[PDB]
Structure formats: C-alpha cells, structure tokens
Design an enzyme around this catalytic site. Sequence first.
Site, PDB file in Angstrom:
ATOM      1  N   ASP A   1     -83.025  32.799  -4.186  1.00  0.00           N
ATOM      2  CA  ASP A   1     -82.209  33.376  -5.260  1.00  0.00           C
ATOM      3  C   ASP A   1     -80.754  33.362  -4.776  1.00  0.00           C
ATOM      4  OD1 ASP A   1     -80.747  35.996  -6.410  1.00  0.00           O
ATOM      5  OD2 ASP A   1     -82.180  35.312  -7.917  1.00  0.00           O
TER       6      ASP A   1
ATOM      7  N   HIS B   1     -81.965  45.657  -2.821  1.00  0.00           N
ATOM      8  CA  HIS B   1     -83.141  44.945  -2.351  1.00  0.00           C
ATOM      9  C   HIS B   1     -82.777  44.049  -1.177  1.00  0.00           C
ATOM     10  CE1 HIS B   1     -81.325  42.483  -5.615  1.00  0.00           C
ATOM     11  NE2 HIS B   1     -81.478  41.519  -4.726  1.00  0.00           N
TER      12      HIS B   1
ATOM     13  N   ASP C   1     -73.797  45.220  -4.575  1.00  0.00           N
ATOM     14  CA  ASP C   1     -74.537  44.568  -5.641  1.00  0.00           C
ATOM     15  C   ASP C   1     -75.785  45.366  -5.998  1.00  0.00           C
ATOM     16  OD1 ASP C   1     -73.811  41.061  -4.911  1.00  0.00           O
ATOM     17  OD2 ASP C   1     -72.678  42.889  -4.483  1.00  0.00           O
TER      18      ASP C   1
ATOM     19  N   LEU D   1     -80.554  51.617  -7.215  1.00  0.00           N
ATOM     20  CA  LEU D   1     -80.944  52.067  -5.884  1.00  0.00           C
ATOM     21  C   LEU D   1     -82.106  53.049  -5.950  1.00  0.00           C
ATOM     22  CD1 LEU D   1     -77.909  52.323  -3.544  1.00  0.00           C
ATOM     23  CD2 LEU D   1     -78.878  50.386  -4.761  1.00  0.00           C
TER      24      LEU D   1
ATOM     25  N   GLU E   1     -70.649  46.081  -8.335  1.00  0.00           N
ATOM     26  CA  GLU E   1     -71.265  45.194  -9.310  1.00  0.00           C
ATOM     27  C   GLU E   1     -72.090  46.024 -10.281  1.00  0.00           C
ATOM     28  OE1 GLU E   1     -74.566  44.391  -9.836  1.00  0.00           O
ATOM     29  OE2 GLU E   1     -74.439  42.526 -10.975  1.00  0.00           O
TER      30      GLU E   1
ATOM     31  N   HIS F   1     -70.502  36.085 -18.054  1.00  0.00           N
ATOM     32  CA  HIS F   1     -71.723  36.630 -17.481  1.00  0.00           C
ATOM     33  C   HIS F   1     -71.556  36.740 -15.972  1.00  0.00           C
ATOM     34  CE1 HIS F   1     -72.211  33.417 -20.509  1.00  0.00           C
ATOM     35  NE2 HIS F   1     -72.848  34.335 -21.214  1.00  0.00           N
ATOM     36  N   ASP F   2     -72.308  37.658 -15.364  1.00  0.00           N
ATOM     37  CA  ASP F   2     -72.210  37.860 -13.925  1.00  0.00           C
ATOM     38  C   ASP F   2     -73.066  36.837 -13.178  1.00  0.00           C
ATOM     39  OD1 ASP F   2     -74.893  38.753 -13.924  1.00  0.00           O
ATOM     40  OD2 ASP F   2     -74.432  40.625 -12.904  1.00  0.00           O
TER      41      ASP F   2
HETATM   42 CA   LIG Z   1     -84.183  50.417  -5.696  1.00  0.00          CA
END
Ligand SMILES: [Ca+2]
EC number: 3.2.1.1
Lengths: 626, 605, 626
Positions: free
Chosen positions: B117, B160, B257, B262, B299, B368-369
């Site tokens: 990714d 993540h 980000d 979170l 972000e 768009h991000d």
């Molecule tokens: Ca989380």
Amino acid sequence: LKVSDGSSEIFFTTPAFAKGKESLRFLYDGIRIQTPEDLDMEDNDIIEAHREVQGSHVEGGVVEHPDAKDFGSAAALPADPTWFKHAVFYEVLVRAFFDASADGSGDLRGLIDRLDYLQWLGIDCIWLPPFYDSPLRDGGYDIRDFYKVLPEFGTVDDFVALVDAAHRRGIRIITDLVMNHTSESHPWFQESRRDPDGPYGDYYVWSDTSERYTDARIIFVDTEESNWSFDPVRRQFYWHRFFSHQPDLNYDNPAVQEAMIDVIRFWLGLGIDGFRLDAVPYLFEREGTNCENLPETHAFLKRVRKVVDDEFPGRVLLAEANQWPGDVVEYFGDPNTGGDECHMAFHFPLMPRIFMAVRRESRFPISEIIAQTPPIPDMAQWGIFLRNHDELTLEMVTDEERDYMYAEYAKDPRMKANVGIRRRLAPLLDNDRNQIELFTALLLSLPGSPVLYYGDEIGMGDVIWLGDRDGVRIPMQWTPDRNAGFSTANPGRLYLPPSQDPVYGYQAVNVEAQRDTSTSLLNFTRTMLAVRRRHPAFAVGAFQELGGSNPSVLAYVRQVAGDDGDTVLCVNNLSRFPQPIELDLQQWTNYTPVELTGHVEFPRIGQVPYLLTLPGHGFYWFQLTT
Amino acid sequence: INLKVSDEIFRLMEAFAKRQGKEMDSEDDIIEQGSHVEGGVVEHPDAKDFGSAAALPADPTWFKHAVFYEVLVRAFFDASADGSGDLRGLIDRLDYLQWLGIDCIWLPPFYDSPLRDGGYDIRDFYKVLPEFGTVDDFVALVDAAHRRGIRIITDLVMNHTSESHPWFQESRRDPDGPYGDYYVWSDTSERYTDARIIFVDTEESNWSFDPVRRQFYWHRFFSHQPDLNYDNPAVQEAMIDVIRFWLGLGIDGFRLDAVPYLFEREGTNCENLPETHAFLKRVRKVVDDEFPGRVLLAEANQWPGDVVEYFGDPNTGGDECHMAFHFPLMPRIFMAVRRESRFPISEIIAQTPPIPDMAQWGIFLRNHDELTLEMVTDEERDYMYAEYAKDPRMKANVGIRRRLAPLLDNDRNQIELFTALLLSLPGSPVLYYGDEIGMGDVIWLGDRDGVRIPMQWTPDRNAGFSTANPGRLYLPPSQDPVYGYQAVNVEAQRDTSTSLLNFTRTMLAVRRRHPAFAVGAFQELGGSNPSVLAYVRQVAGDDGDTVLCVNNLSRFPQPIELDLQQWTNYTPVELTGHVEFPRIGQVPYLLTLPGHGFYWFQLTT
Amino acid sequence: LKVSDGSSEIFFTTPAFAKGKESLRFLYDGIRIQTPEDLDMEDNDIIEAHREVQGSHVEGGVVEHPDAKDFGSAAALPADPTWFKHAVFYEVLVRAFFDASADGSGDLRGLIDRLDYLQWLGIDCIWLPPFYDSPLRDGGYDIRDFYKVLPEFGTVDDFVALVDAAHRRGIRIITDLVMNHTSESHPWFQESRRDPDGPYGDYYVWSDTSERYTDARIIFVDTEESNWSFDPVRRQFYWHRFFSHQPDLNYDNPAVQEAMIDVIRFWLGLGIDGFRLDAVPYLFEREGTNCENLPETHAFLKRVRKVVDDEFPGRVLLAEANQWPGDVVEYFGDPNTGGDECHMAFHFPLMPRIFMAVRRESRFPISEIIAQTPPIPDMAQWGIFLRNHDELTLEMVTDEERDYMYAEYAKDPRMKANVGIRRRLAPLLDNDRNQIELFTALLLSLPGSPVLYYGDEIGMGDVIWLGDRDGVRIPMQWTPDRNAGFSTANPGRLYLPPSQDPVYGYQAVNVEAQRDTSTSLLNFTRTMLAVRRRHPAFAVGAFQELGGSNPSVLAYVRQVAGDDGDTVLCVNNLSRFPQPIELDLQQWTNYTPVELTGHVEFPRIGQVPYLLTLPGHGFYWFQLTT
Ligand SMILES: [Ca+2]
Ligand SMILES: [Ca+2]
Ligand SMILES: [Ca+2]
Ligand SMILES: [Ca+2]
C-alpha cells in the site's frame, strides 16, 4: 454552452457533437433532454453526453437465467471430431483487438471486422479469455454472471454474429470458463450469505471453523493468508481457493454441477466450439488431502465430456492445469477409454526447457521432457503455446522430483528476472529475429496443436509496469495512426495506452508496416503457417528424434502413419554459432528432402550419415518424398 | 572460451561495471540495520546511534511562512543507478529546489515496507527502505537541506503498521508476550459495528481472522494494516519514541496519518474520539518540551469544522497539531471556473472556522488525498455536494489522483490562475513535484501511482532521472506526445523565459518578499462582477505588508469595480513588473482582466 | 535584462549564462562589454553572446601560405609501406561525429574524444572528407583555402592533436583533396580575374571564346549548361568542369603543379598518412579530346607519387575515379613499374553488381566483374566500399560496351528509385538484418581494403529529403539522449537534425543500445572485424572462385601464398531460401574447415565434392588448416 463527455469538449430559440457516433444520451443538470429558454439554460452551462433480456434475473429467491433458444441460431460447420489436432489457435483478448464502438475498449463488434486479417494470417480457431459480466477484480476470471457478456464488450447477439462470421470463413471459437469459483457479486453467492435455507444456501462451502481442509496450500501466498474468509453476512467461513472475492463452487451439491454444465449447454447451444476449463484441479475439496486432483473432480469432468459428446457432437474441451507431465495426462482420462475427459491438455514446461536449452546450447533439455512425456489417447492432443506461466496463477510448472532442471532456472538471469511475469516472445528473446524465428519453428513443428498469442506474430512487446499479467494485454498495434489504429476515440478514454516503446511500439512495429514488407516477421509467420497447413504430419504425425553427431542441434522427423504418408524433417540449431551434424536417416534411404519454403531439392538420403549444416539459431524444414 | 555476463555482454567484471555506469565492487556460459527481535523483545536503535544533523535556528512560526514541496523519493533522482529514486539522489537535486524558491520538503513515507500500500504499510519504524537508502543518508539530507535554509518533514502513519511488522508477528505468536496486546484482538466480528468501512469495494469488514492467533484483529484500512491498540500505554510510549527518533536525527516535523482512527470505543463510529485528541495533545507536549520549534501536521479526510479541533485548544494558542488541511478548496476552485463565479470560493472562506494563533491551514492543489482516495463533502454543509456529479471532468477523475496540468486540459492560463490562488489564499501552500513544469499523469498504472511518475528533468534517456537501463526502472518516464519528457522537462523549461517553471519561480520569489501572503489577514472585497474574486492580504500595524489579488474566473475579459477606500491614497504596484498603477481615491477602482487572468498588487504608501 | 545567443535566452550597481561553456563574447547595442548605469542600460534591454596565424595571407599581389614547420610535429608510426592493404577504413564527416565545442556542428575536437569507440570497433584508419576552409556551396569540395581548416571545425593544431592521438592507438588518418578545381572565393582565382599580368593570372584556364574543348561532356548536365562561364571581372571565359563556382586549376602552368604538390607536403609534413585524389580524370584539358584520362594527367600523378615516395615514405595515395574496371587500372600506373601512381583505386561497380545479384539470386553478376577485373601492381590494392555512387558526382559507374548488366539496373525498382541518391546500407536493403550481415561479409572478405561509412555499423538510415548527398550525412547516433548524444547544444542550433525516424532514428538505434546487447549489429560488425584482423588472407590473400553445383551461392577461397599460409573459405548464399552446394575443394584434400566465429570443426575435406548447406542470405567463414 458546453457539451462534454469527460475527455472531449466543444463550445457553442434554437433547438454536431455526435458527428464518430450516431446512440448518445444527453442531459443537462441531471435532466434527460431531447431550446435553452425551455430549460432555464444560461451562459457557460454544460451538457453531458453519456452512453445509452440482457442479464440473468433473480426473482422469488431464485436466480433465473435465459436459454439458448431465446437468441439467434448460429450456423455450425461440417462436424469433424478431429479438427482440434490440425488447428492453430490464436489467443486474444476481446478488449485488446479492435474497438468498433469507439468507446475506448475493444469489443466483440471489432472482432468480426478483423476476421479477414486472421484468415489471411492462417489461423484455424480463436481462443477468447473470459468475457462474461464481471467486476474485473481478477482479470475477468471472477465471473459475476455466466449468462451476461460484459457490456463493455457487447451483447450476446454480438457473440452469435461473431460465431456466425468466423464460421463462414472456416474458423472456430473457443473460450475460457472458470469452473472452481465465481465472484462475490455473483447472485448465487449473495443468496448463500443471505438465504442459507434458500435454494442457493449450499452452493458454496461454508464452515464454522477455519481448521478444516488444512493440508491444502495457498496459491496466492503473497496476497491471501488463508483459503477461509469470514463472510460478515452469513457469519461463517467460506472457501476461496484463489482470492477472497472468489468463493469456490460447492460441487458436493449436485445442483451446482447441473447448473455449471447447464452454462456449458448455453454457449454450445449458441454455437461455440470449445472450452478451456480453468482451475479444474480445485473443484472438489476433501479433508486430509491437498484438495487437488481428487478422483471425484475427474469424475465430474467425465460426466461433462459425455454431456458434450452426446448433446453437442464435435466440440472440444481443454484443461488449464499447472501440473508436470504425468499429472496432467490424468485430465485426458483413462487411456483405455480413448478419451473420456478433456480433449486437450496443455504441455506447460515446454518452453521453460526450450528457453534453457538455447541458453545452454544443448538439445538435452528438450529431448528429456519429450521422452518423459507419457502417451495420450489417440483422439487427444497436447496443447503447446509459447509462454512459461499460465494466465491465472502466474507460476511456472516445476517438479522437485521429476525435473532435473529444477534448480537451474534460477541460475538464469533472464529467467530469474521475469519470474511471475507473463512476457511476449520478442522481449523474452531480446528481439533477436533469429531466435524468434527459431522458437516459432519449434512451436509449429512439435507434436501438438499450437497456440499463438495476439501480437507475437509481428513482434509486439509488453508494458510490464502495467501489471504482471496486464502488461502483456496491451492493445493490438494495427497502424502507426492514433491509438495504433485500434480505436478512433480519445487516447485518454482508452482502456490501456498503446505501447509507445522506441523499439516495440506501434510507430515502429504494426501489421500495416509488416504487411507491406517482405522479410517481415508477419510474412514469416504466415509463410510457416501456410507451409504447416499443407502437411498434416505437423499436426497428427508421429514424433521420432533422430540420431545426431551434434547435441547442439535438435532434429526430428514427423511422419503420417501409412504408405505414401506425409513425412517432414525438422532440424533446429540451438547454438549461436554455425554447427554441422550427421543425421541417422537410414530409415529413409532413397528419400529426397525438399525444403518447404523454397522447394529446393537436397541430396537424396542413403545409408551414410546425412550431413547438414546450420547457422546460429537456424532451422530447416524438408519434405520426405519418394 | 566465450562468456556471457548478464543482469548482456559476451577485466570482464570491470568492463561490465563501467558500461553499466556502476562501480566495480558495488579456471578457479553466463555470469550473474533497523530493529531486531531478541527473543521476545523488539529492540530498536536510538537517535544517538548515528551522527547528528545540523539544525536551523529555532523559528516557532516558520511553518506559516513556508511553501512546501511534496516529492516521492522514488521519483526525483536516481544516483545509485538501480532504476529507483533513492535518498542519495535527492541531495544532489537540492540546488534545483533552492533555485525554485521552496521553503521545506514534504516526503511521503520512506520506511522499510513491503509496498503493498504505497509504502503506508510500515514494516519497521527504524529502518529506511533499502532501495531508498539508509538512515545515515537521511542525516546527510537533513544536514545538506539545512545548510541552505530548506527543511524536511515526512509522513508518519499513526493508526496502523504493516502486517510484516515484528510487533504484529510477536502479537499473533506470543499473546501472553509483551507485544501480545500491542494490537486490538477480538473473538467475534460483532464489535465496533457502528464504524463505517473506508475501502468499501476492497474490504468487507474491519475485522480479520489471523490463522495463527485464531482471533480477529482490527484494521481500519487493509488486511495487511492492523490497527494499533492505543489503550495500551506501551504502544503510546513506543510510538512517541519513534517520533523522538527522527526528531533527534534532525527532522523539522511530521504529518500524522490516519489519526482520526487511533482509539476505538463501542457505540461510536470510532472517529475523532476525545482520547485521540488527548493523545495528540500529549504528543504536542513532548515535542514542545524536548524539540522546541517542530511542526505536527494532521492528515484528516474531514470537512473544515470537523478538523479545526485538531489544532487544539485556542486558549493555549494551539496545544495539538499546528496544521490541519483545508481539503475542499480546489473542488470549489475547480467548480468556480466551470461556473465563472466566485461564490464557490468565497463561501468556503466565509464558513471556515477560526484557528489558534500559532496554527495554520494547509492548502494543496489536489481534489483527493493520498491515503484513501475520497473527495471530502458534507451533505449538510456542502451546497456543491450534488453538483460535483454534474461535471463530467470531476465525474471522470473520481478517486483518481491527477496533477494540475491534466485537470485543466494543459491550459496555461488556467494553471497560472490556480497557482496564483494557491500562493495567495490564506494558508501554507503545498506543491506536488511536477506541477511547476506542467508534468502529466499516466493514470493507467494506478489511481494513486499515476501521479508518482519519474521527475522529468532532461529530454535525455530516462528523463535524466536515472542512468540505468529503462527495463530496470521502477516506472517508465512518460512518453506522452504532449506531457512527455521530450515535450516538458526541467532542462527546456529553465531555458525559455515564457516557461511555466520560470512563472512559478517568479511567483515564489515575489511571494517570498511579502509575508501578507502567509500570515496576513484575509478580506474579500465586494465586486460588482460575480465572475471576479478580489481579496486583500494585510499585515496588522502601520507600514504593514498590504497586497491586493484580483482573479478572473470567466474565460472572457471582464471588468471589475472594487471597494478600496479603506486603502485610499495608496498606490497599487504590480509585483511581477513593478509597474505603478493609478492611486486609489474615493472612486470605485476599475480593473480589467483577461479570461482566466489574475493581477497581484502591493498597496504601498 | 535579456541575454541571448539566438536560440537560448535568459532573463535577469551590480557588475550564469556561460555555465556549458567557459570563451564567449558579450555585447550590448553593438558595444563589446566586459554595471548598467555605466552603459545607459534600461529595463528590457538585450545582451548578445557571440563566439570569439590561422589562414593564408595575400600580401603584395602574392598569396602567401604558412609552412608545416610553424606548427607542432606529430609523432608518426613505424613505417610499413603495405599497411593500406591490411587496413579497414572508416569514412566519416568531421561535421557529423561529435560536437565538443557545443556549437551545433561536429568538430575535430570531438573526433579525438570518440577515438576509443573506433579502436573498440576495430578500424585501422579514418578517412576524412574535405574539411578545409570553404563556402560550403558544394559540400566542402569547393576549397577556398588549402592551408586553413574550416573554422566551424577547428584549427590546424587541432588536426595535429588528432593525428597524434589516433597514432597513439595504432590508427591512421587520410583525407580527400580536390585536385581539379578550387572555389571562386579562393585567393588564387580572385587574383586571376583581377591581376592577369600578376603571378596568378594564368593559374586558371581563360579563353575569349566558348567554342574550345567542345568534345568534353558536361558532368552536371541538370544544373550547368557549359563548362565555360563568363567572368564579369576579367571579361573572359573560365573553365569549370563541375559547377560555375568551381573553376578548374590550370595544370598547364608548372607553378600550379608545384603549388598543388606543395599543399601535399604541407599536410604530410604535419603527420597525415594518406590522400584520396578527387576529380583527377579532369586535371588536363586538350582540344579534340574528351579532356579526360589524358596522358599528361597521368604524368602529373606519377610526379606526385615520387614526391611522396621520396620525401614522405610510407604514405598512401588514393584515386576517386568514376570509371569502369580497366580504365581505373590506368591510375594504378604502369604494371611493370610495380606502382608509379596512386597506391589504391576504388572498384566502384562492386555492389551495383552485388545488389543485382542478390535480387536475381545468382552469383554470375559478381563472378563476371571479378574475372573482368584486370590485375594490379603487387604493391597496390583495390578500394572496396559499400556504396553505388561517389560522393562528388552522384552517378553510378557503367559501360555500354563492357557491362552486360547495363540495361538491367533500370529494370529494378529499388535501383530505379534511388538513382543519384547516396543511401546507407540498411535502407538500401530494407533493414533486412540477414542481408546487412551478408553484404558486410562480402565487403570484409572480397579482395581489397574495405571502407566503412560511419553509422552503417549500427544500422543507421538517411533523411534523403535533406539532400541527395547530405541525406546520408546525418549526425552520428550515439545515445537516445538529446541530439543523439552528438551535441550538448540547442537542437535548433545544430547543423542537421538527428534522425527521428521510427525505425532508423537514434531513439531506436544508437551505439549505446547496440553496445549493451549481444546479437546487435554493432557486435556482429566488431566480431567480423576482429575475425578478419586475425587472418591476413582477407587482405593480401589470393582470390579463387571455387566450382559449385549451385549458382545461387558465391564461394571462394582466399589463401596467403606460401607454405603454412593463411587459408580461409567464404561461402555466401544469394538466395532468400535454403540452398545446398557441393564444393570442388579437391585442391585442399585433408584440410579441415574450422568456422571462424564459433571455432566449430567441420568435416575434413577430401576428394569427393564437399557438401555445405546455407539458409536464406546466409554465409560461412572457415579456416583451412592442416
Ligand atoms: Ca486504531
Ligand atoms: Ca471448489
Ligand atoms: Ca537508488
Ligand atoms: Ca583541370
């Protein structure tokens, strides 16, 4: 006023944009229009231009599908149950050949227009990768509707027209068909996760635990972590042998089997002549086994073969099986039956050995796999194409026990670099014209029916950066015009950009430039295709490797059994240098070799070893007459 | 004998090394460190393990007076001749960035990652991706950039990690171990059901069953990106130690980000939880105490109003992130051009919430991000919500990151107009690499990868980005007949004075001489023509920097009468040419503009 | 402020543009500058950037010229009076190879930098077309100053440095030199038309009438109407054998002869090793004759040859002579002398026959001209290059009486279309790699010293639209970079645009791409160049065409005279199909052919006709050992 479709824009009491289309729908502020004051239209406003029985329908908890009688009856050919042995196949994406709708994607409608080129080339049957309705999450192999062709390609009646026109010229049509799995978006799966007590609740494999069928290995080990995925609706694990969006069919249910074979009658009822079965080593899954090559899976294939043999005579069933020779022969069926399963299986490790042989400049890598190849039913034929990996699981056939070259492929930089990448013949051989002509001579002379990928006949390349599988699926390069003559639409609206590579691009290589030039690779392929057509020993003849004094060159005689039978001799040098070889052709004493392309007469064979000389990567084709 | 040497040529090692443009060492046929787990503990290096990079004098406001330059390290310059852009190649090209006139460089993630990714799946927070270079090469970057007045910030995924992270491999193997609770685990999937799925077409649940631990783990993004249990106190300190690491090396800040995801609580949507802001408030505390003068960017694919509190408490002057991003900007600017009216732009400014004093908005020219690929819009507060679908261009480039030039059909006039707004509107602007020379996009190789094509420097081989074989290139340079490197590139644009690159440099050099573009007040001026947007950027106090920007959004010449009696007796001086325009009296000041044109003036005494 | 040079512009009490040059001169409003208020410089003004003992000087009515002692002494090689027989020549324009000055035109300075490539290729001597100062009205063949090299190329000291460096690697330098005529701008002519009673008044042919020397034909019959033109100054007719701006030298004056040979000592005194004499059949003109091949013209050549033989030992003199074999042999001199004139003459009708032979697929067109070729002095060598017309008069050698193919060239469309056009090898053979390798095998094996045109070794094409002679004179394609890596300057400032042809362009073919690829044409040419280097029978061996059973293939043995002499065998197929042939090699019984490229051992020759087999347009090279 603006009139737009996304890529093309034109500015203008009155009530031009359509003029290369007829067919288009126009709207303004989300209102389907057919004068500006009537619609409160002001300066600098915008009009959009969008495109305008076709699909299986789920009614009262049951997924209904149309029948072959609801469509036109396509004319068939004189039944010849052995045409697939003499046939030369041409695998080609519908998406990539020609765009007649000018919508940026190749359609069926374009395929009929280009049938004159394929006959002129000299093919006998076209092989179409899956084109049914699908979300295109795994290259059209995740079927969403078996009875609906992808709308981006066209309608079913367009497929009937293609089968008709290709048949008027003596060419047949086959297609892939995924057996093991469908897509999540298929109505059968959506009913399973929603109506377990319904008719489609057991169409797939469901289990409350993942500790089942644990002995099976994961094919896509780099993307998936388990063949079990937890569906959020049914709150149960479903079995997927490939990707998560591809749940496997539950052939343990007999209605599943009856439904799948019904789809087979549907297309055969329309007029198609063949099928390649995809992912057939994974139909049935049983505990304690690898869930592969199970006898009940072969039992289902036998049942299908009859259903065709009985109701659809003269058709053909092919098997995509990434297995070493000796395991794929099982998918031919029992040898005593003379063929009770797939008519053809593909000999995958052919070029992987041919490639290593010309790099090692020795015939032994090719002579080995041929002797190690088991016999097949007489009414069967091996499928030989020029590729190393299959277009579903980008993996190469190998066997730790029965492949002496197993640990040697990785010792080749070209092999070690193109691993998992399906590449065309020309980039595989560094565009060496001598080698391209050599590999094509082998494919058109070795025992089996040859399969040609679209574009390899003119020397096309690939944009591997576009995908490990999609990189070879670039638009066919026809002319040096815009979009390589494949589409008359905007370049930004195309499905994939035509290759602009300095050596492999359409500006440098296309059918038009090669057609208007002798000594072009296209004319070479067509010449060999016409030579092989005039000699059935290239299709049904018996193989006999001859005694040679030089292992750097591969020589073999293909003879049609019987008196006055077709007898050709093929000699193929694998060294990059000139090599001599004495042949042990005493079996054909007083036979006279006649070179096929030039009809040049060579010295009559006798009882002394026959001496030939070849250049680097050269080959010869003689006819053995008396 | 004859010998092939391949990676093909038929002494041999050296001769092959010289022809490949690489160093040699870099009878006796063919011729062809971060964190470490020590039992059950995943040890990581410290900031003192490497040399310290020279820092700049402490500026607690530089982030406001700055123009940022986002560049993927994989795409700018290749010095290792390996086909991919590395760190080492970037330091060479610092002369172009200093000459362009930027202030700081924003770097997408460069950490060790399996690239499932776009590098946002971090396999190790303490090792630079080997293809990009090493941690020691960053110290030279931060050093070299700082010796000339240029700073460095990077992305840092907060929510993540990658599945391949050692923290996750010990969590699924030793549940009773110290890292067994570093992630969120569940026995059922019916938990946190009120949270929506972001990648609705790729994922079917934010829970996923690990075959090893036989339990469900939480992932807000992809299956290989398991979310982190921030209720674990060690997770927090471990992550703030990652922040401590790079800041100790010399980085000037981060962008955090996926922060609106979170923490997670049952009964909520697991978004913008008070504990999430309470954590970030503590991260602020530790950066202001240990490294004074650094910046934290947030972000947040959220609507302005749902992002303002990420700045923190306004009484403290800002006790959280210094920066939140104003996302729906160009979608309104893009609509305004297609509408030839200034209302889409003037309305968002009239409904953008306040910010703390030491805070600053972040403006970039994208719809768009990069993390997700969604266009922000609110059914309640966006009055253009449904009208975006009424634009074929917007409808076609949906979920597709696209550069400035293809978005405006390579219209030089429109590109200059969008660039002027981005460089004059309130907020710190961000420039994506390639927008300065009008680079194109390939699209077909990815929704997000289409804009990640190599930097087109020269019309030479590989666009001057690499000296390696084009086959070994990570991505081939664009060979488009209009957007290609033979058509657009740094070398050609630097020569011709009428080029876009000389235009953007002129605007950057002019904006540098006027702080009102960065910290000045905003005051839209009433215009008789709704097709023209005119505003004043004024610095408070006597003899303060006062600039006037007028922008025409119609494709036709348009007049405009302005309300400048607040600045009576002043004199408008155009910035590019330093031409003196008539002094303003008590008459409505008249100005005429071309189609898609703009003027910048400096009201002086 | 603007700073400009024409193609590159940059905008800026203060007192960047130079930074890829050091060297540049700057002016403002026609004022050589070295602060703006000092020079009254205002906004939007412009500064121009222009470039900055060298030339024969006409003093008191006498054209003085410098001497070779005024310049550096270039080191020479160990004298070998037979090097030109073993040499492989490389004809290349200085203008077209490399631009080191970054001024848009290839210079000498670039030639020294590219000497590593030419040694790596395997050439032995470079041939430079005329580069002396000239108005470039006829491709540098209209010399304006014999003692001044064209400034666009460089200075004489740059030529001494080239001769030095090329000599350090074992490579020699030769150049063209026009003998018959100079340009109007030459000071000798300007003195003739102005000072008839001066020392240079009879340096040219003058006559009050045009009815003199009427029996001579006009070479450029499409441009000129008479070899007499009326000078407006002298009010007299002057004799021009080519164009009006090229008045012919009057060798009837002995001071003209002494001046011309003095120019020959000048360059030989600098260090050059050879000369090709241009337009030598037209030096002397006498009434009643065709003013061609006159005995006094040959007498002057004899005198020159000695002047070299005596004062400059070990040099070489070549003759450009568009004459049929039997008339060019006269320019070798008297056979009994063993060479008293030009060391080498060029066999022009070689490929014109080779081309027609491969199109007619018969060896007879080549075997004929070889037998019809007369013997030459032992210390002489034929000059064989791959072209059909000479670079001065774009005409092909033919003879109505002694050429049986005379009326057959026009019956070939490729020949009839490329008439008067000098084309490269690849476009001449339609880029057929097999034919390119075949024609190169002939040129590198036929009796004589071979000459290679620059770019033909990688397969370059031509932009014929740029000129019937200039079209082949395109910049050398080095890299796929800007200007093909030939110049780091602006593309609009180049002398000629590098070819952007889709198949022949630099993006598709260049030395870099071919160097980094085996099976590339560059590596083929280098391999053959290294093979031929290891065998002197390819240069000084005796030619013997062998008996063959197939006229479709040309076979010949080249043997170095003596015991244990170098003996190679070359077999060249002219058919596009495989062909067998039995060889009459009984003269070499018990000899063993060893293929040169692969060192593969072939069957030992005996007393039975030796059987070989070749593919389409294939060739073989064997070494005959014992
Ligand atoms: Ca989380
Ligand atoms: Ca299954
Ligand atoms: Ca690198
Ligand atoms: Ca004369």
